[PDB]
Amino acid sequence: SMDLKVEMMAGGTQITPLNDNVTIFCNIFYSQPLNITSMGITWFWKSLTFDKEVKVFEFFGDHQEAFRPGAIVSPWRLKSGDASLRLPGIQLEEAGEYRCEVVVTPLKAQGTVQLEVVASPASRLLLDEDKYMCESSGFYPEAINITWEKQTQKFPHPIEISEDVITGPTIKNMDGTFNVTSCLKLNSSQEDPGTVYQCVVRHASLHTPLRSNFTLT
């Protein structure tokens, strides 16, 4: 029962960028020395929407077979117990639950992991008393928080600007990616000298906000 074991990403979820070459982890732990030729590995993908599972890759001890183009599990690594699945240029529709099934007759073990595919926002700041437009494009998922903040010499602590700022609707693109633009109207007459402003973009694909500097002049 516990002479053969499988371990997936801690946390149960892996996140990867669109078009990157992701590696879904699957580690084997056997009570005996691994003899890859007498071992079998199978990877399945299950849609989180349709709840239907498909075989994605199979390792028959002395030869592999990929059902998902480019899919591979390197043999020279499987000996170290690494049954991880490499998927070249992953796509948005490939997000889902992946399952790694290991067979070392008569023992069998498995594990599942969630793969999320994300696209980082491309934020562009452009100038039209002063209309500013911040366009962040090509991001996935849809949810995205755009904000504006300013730091005056008086109060250098960044404070959020929630006036004269209109954040437009998020439009879906053809390649499944998303778009959104936000506009801020600044009046020189009302602003302090040398204030530093910035468009702040928060999104799941970012570990820290994507900022864009600018000062009136």
């Epitope: 078009n19 349709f50 183009p69 480019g70 070249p88 240029g89 992953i90 796509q91 529709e93």
Partner: antibody, heavy 121, light 108 residues
Framework: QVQLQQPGAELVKPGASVKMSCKAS????????MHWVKQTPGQGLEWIGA????????SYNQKFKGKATLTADKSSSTAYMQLSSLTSEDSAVYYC??????????????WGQGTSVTVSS | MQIVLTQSPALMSASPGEKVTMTCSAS?????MYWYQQKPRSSPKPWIY???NLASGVPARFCGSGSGTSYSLTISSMEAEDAATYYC?????????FGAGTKLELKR
């Protein structure tokens, strides 16, 4: 948005060769399998094979090995299929098709308009 | 182990409004069956995938089902625009194969 452009038709001589082109656009050419399907009134739809532009991996229908060869040009996002030493039996429409991924793995979702090939003297 | 798909009947007639059922029998078991629709002088269109999911744009009157070696495509209520040829396709093992298709015509 995903588009697959194929020339309308080709008139070819018996014994000759021909290269069918398929201009792909609207998506990452190297991340999807490109398939080719033969269609003649007599045998319905027949699979020729597929190629993963990205690492060039191919899968062929045994009946076409030695007859068809799939290649790809990444720089131009174009799939190609070559038929060697043609005979009238090769006269048919040859479709270009993109296989999806995920819920659409192994499903030919997008098709080119097809190139009608006529083998004749 | 080439899997052969046998579609029956080869030709079907349906009056507008009638229920239509076409089958696809596979020589050996298959994980999933896919269907495509094709009208004269144009390329086939994905109609059904993963055995029962409709491709975007396909009318809800269509229904696909099946298991193992036996599958079917149904039309609750026939319509003129449904007259076409339907093919099943599988790829659980090489080579990918298509059924000979079922030509569905209008009945009169």
């Amino acid at each position: 948005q995903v588009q697959l452009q194929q020339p309308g038709a080709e008139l070819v001589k018996p014994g000759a060769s021909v290269k069918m082109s398929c201009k792909a656009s609207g998506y990452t050419f190297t991340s999807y399998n490109m398939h080719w399907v033969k269609q003649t009134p007599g045998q319905g739809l027949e699979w020729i094979g597929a190629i993963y532009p990205g690492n060039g991996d191919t899968s062929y229908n045994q009946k076409f090995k030695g007859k068809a060869t799939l290649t790809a040009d990444k720089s131009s996002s174009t799939a190609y299929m070559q038929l060697s030493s043609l005979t009238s039996e090769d006269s048919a429409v040859y479709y270009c098709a993109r296989e999806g991924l995920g819920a659409l793995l192994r499903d030919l979702y997008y098709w080119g308009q097809g190139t009608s090939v006529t083998v004749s003297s | 182990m080439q899997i052969v798909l046998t579609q029956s009947p080869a030709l079907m007639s349906a009056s507008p409004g009638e229920k239509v059922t076409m089958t696809c029998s596979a020589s050996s078991s298959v994980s999933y069956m896919y269907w495509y629709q094709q009208k004269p002088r144009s390329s086939p269109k994905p109609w059904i995938y993963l055995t029962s999911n409709l491709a975007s744009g396909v009318p809800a009157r269509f229904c696909g089902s099946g298991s193992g070696t036996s599958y079917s495509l149904t039309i609750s209520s026939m319509e003129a625009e449904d007259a076409a040829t339907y093919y099943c396709q599988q790829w659980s093992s090489n080579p990918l194969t298509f059924g000979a298709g079922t030509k569905l015509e209008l009945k009169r």
